[PDB]
Design a protein around this ligand. Structure first.
Ligand SMILES: NC(=O)c1ccc[n+]([C@@H]2O[C@H](COP(=O)([O-])OP(=O)(O)OC[C@H]3O[C@@H](n4cnc5c(N)ncnc54)[C@H](OP(=O)(O)O)[C@@H]3O)[C@@H](O)[C@H]2O)c1
Ligand SMILES: Nc1nc(=O)c2nc(CNc3ccc(C(=O)N[C@@H](CCC(=O)O)C(=O)O)cc3)cnc2[nH]1
Ligand SMILES: [Mn+2]
Length: 159
């Protein structure tokens, strides 16, 4: 099955100038816990933003161009990216905006972190249809000394 995982600020903002402006270690820990030992599919811009492989995960990068790093797997279409994952229980799509839009219709599950941050961005999570999704997990956390915004971890399943 295909899942998307993302962290969204106000208005579904997910990035600005090829970075995630906020810094929430608790959310990065959630991301790691939910992606470790699964393939991750990302677009080339997200690959560049992260800047290095994510350890302990098969990293698959979408690009129309030939790859530039054999520590990761390079593919040229959505269907090729899925194939390159092989027979696994769960594929994690890790963005960015353009990649999320293409995988959303194929996805069965969304792992969304809703961050209480105002951020002026240039990239958004898709404007998905709320009626298509059932919330099956929701956990809110207040800000603390390590995490400067409140945030809520949610898992949605396609109805
Ligand atoms: N908050 C979050 O959860 C989160 C998660 C991920 C990323 N981000 C942020 O999102 C931003 C990046 O998102 P983005 O929308 O600009 O870019 P993106 O989706 O990461 O990358 C788009 C690139 O992927 C390739 N690509 C995408 N679909 C393809 C297809 N079907 N076939 C072949 N290649 C394909 C293309 O590379 P070529 O140009 O080489 O063809 C394209 O330019 C950054 O700000 C990043 O920090 C945030
Ligand atoms: N919930 C969520 N939060 C994110 O920040 C996020 N980021 C991306 C893409 N960008 C990134 C950027 C850095 C790392 C990262 O350094 N992760 C380390 C965690 C270090 C830790 O455990 O604190 C990793 O091993 O996953 C992951 C994804 C995609 N989906 C997301 N989803
Ligand atoms: Mn159902």
């Amino acid at each position: 099955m295909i899942s998307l995982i993302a962290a969204l600020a106000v208005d579904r903002v997910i990035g600005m100038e090829n970075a995630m402006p906020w810094n929430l270690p608790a959310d990065l820990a959630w991301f790691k816990r939910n992606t470790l030992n699964k393939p991750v599919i990302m677009g080339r811009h997200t690959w560049e933003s992260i800047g290095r492989p994510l350890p302990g995960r098969k990293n698959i990068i979408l690009s129309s161009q030939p790859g530039t790093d054999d520590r990761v797997t390079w593919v040229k279409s959505v269907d090729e990216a899925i194939a390159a994952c092989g027979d696994v229980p769960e594929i994690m799509v890790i963005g960015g905006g353009r990649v999320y839009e293409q995988f959303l219709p194929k996805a069965q599950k969304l792992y969304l972190t809703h961050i209480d941050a105002e951020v002026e961005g240039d990239t958004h999570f898709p404007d998905y249809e709320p009626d298509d999704w059932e919330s099956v997990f929701s956990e809110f956390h207040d800000a603390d000394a390590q995490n400067s915004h409140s945030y809520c971890f949610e898992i949605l399943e396609r109805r």
